[model samples]
Each structure stands twice: as structure tokens, then as C-alpha cells.
Target: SDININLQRKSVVLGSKSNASVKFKEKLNADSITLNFMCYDMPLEATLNYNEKTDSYEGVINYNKDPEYLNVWELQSIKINGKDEQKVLNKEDLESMGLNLKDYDVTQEFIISDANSTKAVNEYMRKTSAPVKKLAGATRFETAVEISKQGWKDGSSKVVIVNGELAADGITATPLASTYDAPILLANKDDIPESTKAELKRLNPSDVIIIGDDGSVSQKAVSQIKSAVNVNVTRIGGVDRHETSLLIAKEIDKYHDVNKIYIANGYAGEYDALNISSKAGEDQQPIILANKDSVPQGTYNWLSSQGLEEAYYIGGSQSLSSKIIDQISKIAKNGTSKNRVSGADRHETNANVIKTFYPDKELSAMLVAKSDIIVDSITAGPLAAKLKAPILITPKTYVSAYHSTNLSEKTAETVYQIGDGMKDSVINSIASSLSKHNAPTEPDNSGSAAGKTVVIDPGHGGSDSGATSGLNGGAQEKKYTLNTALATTEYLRSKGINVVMTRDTDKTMALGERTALSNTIKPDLFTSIHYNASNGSGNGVEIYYKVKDKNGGTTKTAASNILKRILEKFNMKNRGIKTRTLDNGKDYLYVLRNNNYPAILVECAFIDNKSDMDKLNTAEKVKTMGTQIGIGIEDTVK
Candidate 1:
């Protein structure tokens, strides 16, 4: 097959909203021209322009087109509508519009042709050959042309050369080398400079990654020398403190004795340490090295006041190594020393220690209230649960120091009472014992509801209205329940009680889904709202609690008083709270046994009763009923 190349005339219309049109006089000539334009389901509009003075044209094409650019036509002025305004596409705008051009390679195509089909074909084939283009300092146009030729091969045998290099025929050659300088390669221990080696020796064991050095040798030398060091060490790689901390954590985890990890004067280290400590909780075990003169005095004071009894003084790399070895030897002989090591703040080293030693224990420690402790705790708690380790949170306290930074009151108390330096010791003692005893595994058997969180489930929603009566029975149970729930929620929120409702609007909620959501929140108490359906004879409010010892003699907490309190508010028979044991053994009604929290299912009122329905249907009465339910919850929680 023979490939024939030809130039075709093409033009493009471009303009802005301010100017309606701009055209190019230079007719685009190519074997084929591709026109890429934006297309939307909306109205079509664009501005076109033709510059006669420069014989060039530039404007915006605002619509999608099959073949956006005009081909086989002489270039003329372009026309566009709307307005003419300067507009440049940005990365985000281009991405959102789905018009990212950089993701594709720009090239032109060619077709094979013959005047006398047979003769032309033979002649063209005999003379057909690929072209070779020099890439040294090649202009963008030249590069584009080269790319086009390479892309138009007709599968014929050919040889091509690029930049004085040999190439196969009928194939175009282009340079693939980058136009920019390559990144600097780092050095390992073998290639580390003597000066860097000296610096490494001077650093504390906790003082890993060296920085602020020049030369390729100096940069590469850190990693190589780091590998040679007896203790773990590396240069910081990330831009942010968190990222750097993560890197340090990875390195720390590589060592067995990393139980006593330290950070020297780096914010990344501090951040990492804090994250670790927050995670370690009571079982924290880490030794951080900060120059007392370099670090804040308050921070030093805090660490010094922790639970740990021994404070070894290690000066430089040599001293740090000896002390670390001595500690490890002691642990090896003593079979994991029970002594604790604490710091001013939680550190990654502490977290790693807990994770390594007490993998199945929940670990939590004191932290500044404003830190990411809460968020981190929420995440780590579930994970710990999965690992059979549940963390315990110590109350925080506020402390004033030379740093002028106020610590959480709980944390401050821990630091002050335990002596901040003894933090590690206190944490270790608490965590180790707790882990051994499997503390979190024990349920809240105390049966005390004070300070416990409760979740309220408002039943029914939107189309699946629970029940209705009066005026063609159009009134929905969902409307009544939602109104009640909202009012109750407001009241509870006022009393500083955290309340979560399954649905606060006229939206349908699946019983099972509500149960699952309740479990995730792990509230102390759970309640479901619903209206009763009876044969018109069943009147008054009835509270339903899951029965204990019903199936295989299982005992569960009952919300009897809660039901009584709520029932008293209504002007009807209490009917009392009933404990119904299902014969099937499974609590199929959900939102009861499915949740870890003690729960009650309430049938607020019999919708079939004329008087009850009438009173329940009224907005004002519903609000009052909701308030009464809220009062019941308050009492239950109290």
C-alpha cells in the first residue's frame, strides 16, 4: 500500500462574548484537519473572527461539532455570536467542561490515492518511504509535523532516521527524550561523603533525616549513610508535618526496639509524636529527644512530669545508641519491661509501641482538646474494636506554661499530677493492665444511664405514612411523629443532651436501616415512635419493651419508667409498658435487639380512636406530646 500526503484548506471561527467574531486569513493546509469543539445539550452559540492584517485568526469555539473546523475551503473571516471578551481556560474549568486537550496527542493523518489506480499505486509504492526529522532544538511546528508523519505509516517496509540516528524505512522517527533536566539521584551509604558521615554521628538516635545540604552527593549521601546507621534514620521527604510524620512512622516501625522512638527538633517529628500518643492512649511507650533549649520549656516540663521514673541523659549519637541498647537489653531479659515512658504530647513512637505490643487493646491518651484527637479517636476506635482493642479517653485539663499554650484541663492535670515527664510511665501502666484484662470487652453492666448518649427514632415518612384517621383518614402518622420528634429533639438539645433522630421530616425510613444507623452511633438508649392500629376498641398509649428470658432466657434492660413518664403526659390510660417476647426468637421489628443500646418501641396512641386521632392530628397537640417524650428521654438519661 502507498501513502499519499496532501494539504487541505481549513478555517476556524473564534471570538469572545464581547466581540462577536474573529477569522484567520491563513488557510490551514493538511491531509486532514481535526476540529474539536465543546458541545452541550443546551443552545448552540459561538464567536468567530478573521484578522486580515496579520493573516491570522484566534477566537473561542463554544459548541460541539462533528468536524469543528472547515476543510476544503479558502480561509475567510470567522463569525461568532454573544460577546467579545478575553478568556483563557484553566485546569479546573477545562476538566469540568470535559475539554482537556493535553490528555491527547496532536497529529495529522494522510490517505493513499492513485490517478490510474493500478499504475499510480505501483509508482507510489515504489517511491514511498518514511521521513526522518532532526529533534535537536526542534521548533514546536517541526515537532508536530514529525509526529504527524510518524502517525501516518501505511505498514510498508521503511527506514527512518531521527537526530542522526538510524530508523526503519517507511517509519518516522522522533525524539522521546525529555526536554527538561532530570531529577537528582540520591546517594546511599556506599557513596556518602565523609562530612555527612560526621554529621550523622553527631545526630541523636531520634534525630534522623538531615537537611539543608547542597550538592548531589550531599543529598544522596543521607539515605545511604542512614542505612548504615545502627539506629533508624532518614531525611524528611514530605512537605507537610503530617506527611513527614507518616514517613517517620514507617521508618520507626521497621525497628523492634522502636518502642522508645524520639524526634529531634523537627515539627514533623512533633506532629508524628502527637498522632502516635493520641493513638496510644494509656498504653503509650515512647522516648522523644528534643533539645531542652530548642524545644518550648512548657513542652519539656510536661514530658518531665509524666509517670516514667527513669530519665536517662543521652547527649549525642554515641550516648543515645548506648542508652537505647541498654534499654532493649533490659526489655529482652525482663520479658517486656512494664515501665512507662511519657512525653509532653502524644507521639507516633508511642502509638507504634502500643500497636506493636498491645495490638488487641484499645489505646487512648490525653490530648489537647483542639487537636484532631476526637476525629482520630472516632476512626481509631472502630479499628481497635475490630482488633479487639478499645481505647479509653482520659478527661482533658487546661494548663498554663512558659509556652503560653493552654493544654486541655484533663491533659494538664495528668501532666501536672503525674509529672509531664512521667506521662509514658502512667500511660504504660494503665494501658498494659487494661490490655491484659481486656477492659473494653466488659459491658456497662452497672446499669447506670447517666452521661450516656441516646438516639430517638421517629418512625414513618413521605409516602409510607404509618396511620391516619379523621377527614377521610388523610392525616398521616408520619406527619404526627416527625413533628413530635422535632419538638422532642429541640427540648433535649436545650438540656445539653445529644439526640440523633432517624428522620426529622416526612420521609420514609426502613426499620432495619434505622436500627443499623442506631448501632453505628452506639447511643446509650434507643427509642422508636409509631402510632397504634387496632380494631377501634384498642385505645390509649401502650409502651412495648423487648422481653428478657423470652427465647433462651436472655435478659435485657427494659425502659418501663420511660414509657410510664411519657404515658402520664397524655390524657389517656397508661395501659402500662408491656414486655413482649417474640415466638420466633428474632426481634424482627428491629431498632430493639439489633442495637447495642437499650431501647424501647412506643405505640404513641391508637390512631383508630376518634378522640385520640383528633388530638394527635392537631399540630399543637403533637408538639406537646413530643415535649413529653423528650422529658421521658431526659429522665431515662438522668
Candidate 2:
């Protein structure tokens, strides 16, 4: 099939949102492709596909079609109903991403909210603190490789290789993969991805098992495999994915005695099966594949021939229909007993499966990944089993019933995020929500800065004297910055705030070194104090807040509060607090950008200006500025 992509229109007028499409042939068989848009707030990730009838990739647009003339989000203070000068919210913005907004509980504003989707609760979760860890990689193939490295340390006598494109092949491959105590490595239809090959080389298995027919695993790919590992490559399966699963079940029994078997719907999301199979990995039982509504004749024949001890179905009636699940049970009744695990939805079912196996609150770590995508979670499922932990799934946000109890108990453990495919904020929000329940007693939100660590940065020390003043060769910027910190420390300490000093004495440090010190402290807030120099001019007291990602909108408010207090105390030129860029370039200050906390840089005053220095040089005046800085931080804690 030939492939062609064309833009429908060009030389565009840049007023409203400009959308463009790609025209491709019907034979170009792909559902949707992920396209990262520049400056787009959210990823344009859903419903993008080539319509067979239209011969165009509809339901999507090429991002930034005209970046040189992209529309800015114009915030107009337009009148609402021509009564009050309040802005009107657009309903289409809330809906119409191909989802419905026909009716709702509330619709006064453009954005809709209800008990089902929390607004205030979502807001509160962002402020709370909890442990969040991400096991991420640049790509799905890379993530799968990393997961293999993380789990299977000892080389296996047998390693299973499956086509990553065809997730169905690997659905039943896991139970068998688990039996070998091996990882199911993936191969592209053409060549095995380099990283997966690298992992295979690391494992150095005596036998390499490839599932699927020549169509599934190309003959060329098999030659590529033997080239890498001299070990024998065994190809299994006949005709289809389900038959291939039967081949694997037979393979696992050949290696080791198989007891219980699990039947899951292969045509559906392999993940539903993945969750159950990982649990089955605790003991090397096999999982067999069937269709959503029926057990294939091939699968049923295999089941009757086997002397299985017990059997379990991995889904509700909709997936592995109740009629089919019961039929399997009846066939095994005289010999092998049967049971099933099901839930209200996919996530709930995954959580329920976890709860069934774990049945406990305590854990070392919890691994989470995007439920919608396979590669991210599919690769991760086995690792969770190996870690003696559970694999939980989400749509990149919100916590489930079982995981919430498991996670929030401590707000103290690591939540190992599965991959970079999941959004950072969603992962963070989930982690942060934990502190709301069983928050550690140390950092109480009773008052501002109370029990919170604040890292105070005194700019320039030792050989680096920042902005030296000449009031008969008076104090330099370094001396005043330190003094401000020292005095501020005393005030904050008196009020029960945890004040951490970057340096108490004169010292030389690299930008990286300083940033490292702040991160190590893990402070709630960080402020680097300095006095400006502009050729005996350019005098002001300004606070440069974080440019972007303002610690969930906290940095700006903190900077504002401190700026207000400092200005009120000193009565200097109100330079104001705002985000600043060096050389008019779109880059944040090194200290602000690197540190993983709410951070700000304070420009106290111009030390070179004789008049400004006269007021700032007095020890009493400088100490007062420091005390006011303390008050500013206290306002944050409260």
C-alpha cells in the first residue's frame, strides 16, 4: 500500500485555532499516532485516525501549523449576560473532544464539575505531600528493556520473545514467561529493537522461544535472532494468537509441571489478562487465551486433555462470558476446581486482583502506569510480580480503592511510577493526595512555615564578592546576604520554622553545588538573597519568582507576600516580583530551574548606589529586612 500525507489548506489566516489534516490512502492501516504539540498545555492524544471512506487522517490536526503566527490565549474581560463584567466560559471547551456534554448536574460555568469528577478535591490533592517515584524511559521499547533489567537478574534457561505490535501474542505468553522465571522480550516485525536485543544479550539464555507464525514473527527476524544468540530458537503456534497461547501452555508444561490454568479474553486489552497473570506468577501456573464471548474449540480441546488442578477466569461476563467461564468450570469439575475474579471496571478489576493477592496495607513500593497504553504497563507487570508488589493502573490520574488504602497509609513510601509516557503532574497529584490521609506529623499545616524546611541562600561568598559598595570601603553584597540569612534564621527559628542555611560562613560554591545543597535539604521553600549592581544606578527591591512550573502556583504567591513585607519594611523603590529571563531568552535562573521546590531569588537593593547602600549598610536596617523575610515565609505556612 502507498502512503501520502497532505495538508488540506495553507497560507492561513492566524486568528482562531487553525486545524490541518493529512490525506492518506485507505491501505495506510494505523489507528492513531501520538504527536507532541509545541506549547500545547495538554497532549493531543485521542481519536486521531485515517478515515477509510474520506481517505484523510481525520479526528486530528498537525500541531503548530503556523508557529510564527500561532494564536495566543486572549483573556478578555468580556461582559457576562451584559450584566456584570465577568467573563463567560465556553461550553465547547469543556466538551466536544468527541465526548458528550448533552446534560449534567451543573452548567453555570463553562467548566463542569460534580461528585464524580472532583474540583476542590483535585485542588487539595496538589497541595498535599506524598512519595512518588517514576520508572520511566524515553520510549515503550526502552521502558520494556529497563523493566527486564529491573526484574529478571539471573539469566533464564528459557527466554520468550514476542511481537510487541501484536499485544495478543504476549497476553498468554506471560504465564509461560513467568514459569521460566524469565522476561518476555519484544521484537519488531522487522528487527528486534536494539535495547531489547541488548537486554537479551544480558540474559544470555540457553533457549530462545519465539511465539507466532512466520506472519507474526518474520523469518528474517528469526535469522537476526540466531545471529545475536547462538542458542536454539524454537517457534511455537499455528494459525492465530489463541492457538499460539496453547502452544506456549504446552511449552511451559514440557519444561515444568503445570497445575492451575487461567482463561482470559485475548481479543480485548491484554492488560486485563496481564494483571491476573502477574498474580499467577507468584506460582508458575499457566494462563490460556480465549475469545471475549466464547472459548475457542482449540482452547477447549487443550483444556480437556490437560490434568489441571484448578482454573480461574480473569474477567467479567462481558469479557470471558459467564456461560463460557461456567462451561470451563463444568469440564474441570470432576478433576480441576474453578473460580473467577471480576470487578465493576478495568481499573477496579486490576485493583481487586491486587487486593486478592496482597490482602495487606504494607508494601515496599507500588508501581503505577497508564492503563490506556500497553507498552508502559505491559512491560512493567512482570517487574511488579518480581518485586513482590502490585501493578496498579490509571488513566494518568486519580487513585483507586485498594491502592488508596495501600498508598496513603504512610505518605511515607515510594510510589514507583512506571514510565515517562504518563504525565508528571498526574503522577505527582496522585502522590500528593496521600499526605491528606496519613500525613507525617512533622510538617503540620497549622501555621505558616511551621515544621516546614526553608533553605536560605546567601549569594556570593569567599573570593566572589557580589556588588561591592564603597562607603569608605564598606560591606559587599556577600556580607549583607549572609547577614540577612543569619538574622532571618533567628526569627524563623523562634517561630518554630525549620530554617536550613546554605552557608553560615564565607565559602565558594558552584551553581550546581548550591542547587544540590537545596535539593538535599528538601525544603518547602528556597530563597537566594542578593543585592544588585548596575553602575551605581538601577536600584530596587525585586523578587524573581520561578518562570514556569511554579510548584503548583505557590512560588508566585510566596514571592508576592515576601515582596510586600520587604517593601513595607524598607520603603525602597517597588521593583515588584515577577518572572525574569536573562538576555531576553526563554530560560529560567539556574538556581530556580534546578531545585525541586518552591524557589525565588531576592534582589534586596543596589549596593553600588551610595544612597541605597547608606540605608542598607546599617546592621539594624539589614536585620529588619531579614526579620520581614521571615514574616513573609510565615504567611505561607499559615
Candidate 3:
């Protein structure tokens, strides 16, 4: 019998392992007793034999699967029907198999199992070689323990108790169990004392209360304890420590001493209850119990017998001294004292008792020593001196057991010495007189109110209706200034001058807002209009200016000269055109900073004086004053 074999070349190429299941199809036709097929560079081989009875080809092939390319492709080898073949089939045979060998060309394709195959393979090989070793050193736990100890030794960490609860630094304690599980505790570092810290770090107990022999726990000791076991270490000592601890906590609370607190609560049951109890009683403070449930009943009973009500509990022990100190420093810079009292003290009385007193005057005891007496006082005494208000001391100093002899001197204005058994009448009299001493008036505004494009700032408006006139039966300063500024603007405008008024009616303008408005206008001069007042005194006209430039330099000579001319007409005390730096350096007086123009803050006259108030109260007098100021401004500008 004659036999014909067909061989068709079919190959698959893959770029990566992920393309392993990819396949190509090829059809074949055969009629005879046998057939043969062959392929080159294939990983597997196969053959087919014609079965006369079944009229079909049936066979298997030999193949070599490339391990490296297993994910990318499955290659097969050539074979003959039931045998190995090494020859290509004829064109007729290929055609018989329904494959046009002449029309089909060799095919090429690119495939990749994974884009990161190279990296993945390299990593695998590296891992397989030496298990990817780390720097030869102590484990993370060892490092953390070492760092904790070093921090303690540096005095940056502290062991403390707050509200009778153990705290590290100032934060609540963390139980030993949690500490042990923390990643920070497991990080390795080469700088710390390894073994001791590492061992301590492993304990991670929630509470371990340890009292040193000296009744004081060093930061290093606390760190060591915190690293090895979770526990709170509270130092208890004599009166000083007790007081200091409370003071420290109070300071911490005010953000004046400590920044944070950490407590460790673990293995506390190992400590002696008697020692804890004794320390608590001596300190007259509560003891922090680490393990309430584990504490022996006998210990509890003993504590009760010693008049200890109950023990306090804390979370864990950790150092927070550094944080606390930082916080305290910040608080100190802005802290306000709270101990001084400067206002008047009133007593119950039946009839309206009136006693008149003035600043800088000595009062007779006979007048004030009587019980149930009311006093009338002038704010400014005859001497008429100005002094800065003394700062008040806080009550916190008392609880901290800190007494400053200078405290009284520092707040002298608010402090008074009284003999024992002083009657209420004497106290009341003194209080009433002290209340009359008003804070010193700021120095008069001084500057030229001339030639520059001037904006008249009329103070107070809207809801902030300024002072009600005591002399004129309650005339408002708001109305007075607005009318004054309008008349001033009109007079200046008539002189062929450009003028702007900050407000024409009762309206509130914040200092900053007023300055901002003046700045926007870019005026050459700013004049704030106001009627001053005192205890029925200070009746004359005055012009005022800030003492210094924005850069803290002296005011310009031009500005000074202009102000001198304007004030010369009033014949009021020059007040010498003084300059003052504001309490806050942030602003050099908004008017001064905002404009290149010279500015003056004017205190026209005291509304408290009947004569001055009467003159200002009238439209005609206001017009006259306005004209004078306008002429002064014009002369300066000219």
C-alpha cells in the first residue's frame, strides 16, 4: 500500500509566562496506511497513523517543555505515524491536508507573562541565595529599649503622677501589653544600651509601680522600667516632693510645665501595697494602684485601716518631660497674673452715704472711717500724674506654695496693707478712693494737621456711640465729632483744599478699619477728631500724634512744626509733642504706617468741663473751632 505524509509548520512564540494557554490551529488530511510530520526547534513531537477501519489518523508526539518559557509557551516536536520523522512533507500532501503551504508565511509574535518578570526573578534569586540579611545588629526591641534609656539619662523624660495617677512625662500610661505590641518598641537602633533596654522593652506590662529607695524616680529608671515592663513609677517624698508634684501637675494643666504624660500599667501587682500606702499618706495624695484586682485583700484592708480611702489608677509609665517643658515655656511668655484686685469693694448700707475723694489726696479717717458711708471720688487727683497699671498676680501662685515678696511690689497699685481688725468702714473708704484712681491718660496726640490731603477721623458710631457728656446732660461724643468733622471738611474745602471725613454720622469704626480707609485714600494727612474728658478738668484744645515712625524712628520735623502751629493758637499745654511706641510692635499706629502723609490725633477739649462742653455743644462754636483748625492745616500745607 502507498502512503502520503503531510507536514505543516506551526509555531507559537510568547513574551511572558502569562501567555502559556495560547494556541494555533492547523488542519490535516491523509489517506493511506501511514503518515509522517516533522518540526524543527519545537519542544514537543507528535505523529498520526491512518486507521483503515476508523478512516482517521491517531497518534502521539514527543515534546520538550522549556522550563523558563513554561508560562510563555508550550512547544511540541516532530513525529511520523508511530515513529520519529526528520523530513518535510510534499506540497501535494500539504494541499491534501487543506493547508496552503505556499500562501502561509512564517509568523512572529511578542508576549510577556508579566512586565516585572525581570525584577521578580531577580528578587526571587536574591532571596533564595542568603535570605536577604539585614545589618548585623540588635533587634528592633533591643534598639527601642536602648533609645528609651538614653532619653531618660538625658533628663528629657520624667516619671510623674497626676491627679494621683501614674504618668510618664504628662500623658496617661500605656499598659505593658500594648507597649510590647507597639512597632516603635520593636524598632532596632544601634545607639541605645541594648540588653537592658531590650529586656525591659519585652515586658510591655500595662502597670508596674516602682518606688525607688530615695523616693525619687530618675528618668533613666522610668525608661528602663517602661521598656522592660509596662508599669507606672511614681516618686513619693516629703513635703517638698508632694507640693512640687501637685504644683507640677497644676503647671502642666496650664500648659506651663509639661507638654505630655505617659503612664505604664503592668506588673503592678508585684509591688508592695504597704509601701504604696505609706507614700500616699505622707504625700497626703492618692496612690496609683497598678493592679486593683490582683492586689491582696489584706493589703486593701491594711490601707483602709490607715485611713486611705481608695487608690488611683494610671494607664502606663512613659517619659514626657521634654514635651512638658516646651509647653511650659510657651505658656510663660503669654501668661497673665491673677492674684491682684484693684477695683472698688462695696458694702451694704441703708442711706446713700457720699464721701468725696480725689486722686493723689490723703483722706481723713474721720470722713471715711465711719461705717455705712458712700464716697464720691475724682478719677484724677490733684497731682495729676500718669502711671502704667500694675499687672495682676494669679491665684495659682498660692496653691503652688510659691510666695514672691516682690509680688506686692510688682502689683503695688492693686496691693494694700491693712492692720488686723480694721473695720468695714475703713476698708470701704480705702476701696472707694482706690477705685477713683483711673489709669493714666495716654500722652496727647501730636502732629501737623495741615496742607496734606487730610482725612478727618471722627471717632465712634453705630452701636459704639462714644462717651455721653457729663457736663451737657448726656450729649454724645459721636454727634459732637461728626458735626465737628463736617464743619472742618467744609472749611478746609473752601480754602481750595481736598478733604475727606472718615464718617459723617454716628457709625462704629474699628481702629484698624479706620486706618485701612485712610490708607486706601492715600491722604497726605490724617486727623482723628475727638473731644477729651477728665474728672471735670482738662478743658482746653489739644493736638496729638504718635511719638515714633513705623520703624521706631522719631517723627518728622515737618510734622512736628505743623502740629506746633496748630496748637499755638489754642494756647493749651504743648504736652511737648511727645512720641510713644505702642504696646504691640505689630502696628506703628495704622495711620502712620498706611500713609506717607503726616497725621495727628486731635483731642479738641474735655467734654467734662462745663465751659468747654458748652462751647463744643453749640454749632457756632464748632464752626469757629473748625475754621481755626482749617487755617492751621492750610498754613502748614502752604
lDDT of each: 0.37, 0.62, 0.34
Error of 3 at 156 (Å): 99
TM-score, candidate number 1: 0.30
lDDT (tens digit, per residue) of candidate 1 on 1-638? 11111111011112111112222222432111222222223223333344455333334333232333432111111122213433333445434443223322212111112211244343343211011112111322232222222222111111111111101100100000000000011133226444333333332133233311222124344455556454443343333332333333333334322233333323323333333332332222232433322323443344333323333222223222343434433333331223322222332223333344344322222222112232223222212222222233322221111011111111111110111221222233232222222222111111122345567777888678877766325666676676667666656654656666675445666878888878887776787878886656777887666665244221122345556666666677677766654687655466665766677777788877876666665445676777787788787675
Compared with the true structure, what per-residue lDDT tens digits does model 3 show for residues 1-638? 12222222112222111101101133233332222222333333334555555344544322234333222222222222223333444556545554433222222232212211245354332100000101111332333233233212211122221111122211111121111111112211112244544434443334433322233344655565555555665443223322332333232233222222211122331112111221222122332232322223332333333332222322111211233223222333321212111111111000001110111222111111111110000000000111111111111101000111111111112222111223332232222223223311110000113334667787777888776666655777787777667656655654545565665545567877888777776775677777777667666665555554533332344345545554554545444444445676422456555545567766666767786666655455665566566666676564
Q: Is candidate 1 or candidate 3 better by TM-score?
A: 1
Best by lDDT: 2
Comparing 1 and 2 by lDDT, which wins?
2
Off by over 4 Å in 3: 1-452, 549-576, 584-590, 593-596
Question: Comparing candidate 2 with candidate 3, which one achieves the higher TM-score?
Answer: 2
What ranking of all candidate models by lDDT puts the best one first? 2, 1, 3
| lDDT, model 2 | 0.62
- How well does each candidate superpose onto the true structure, as a TM-score? 0.30, 0.46, 0.27
Rank order (by TM-score, best first): 2, 1, 3
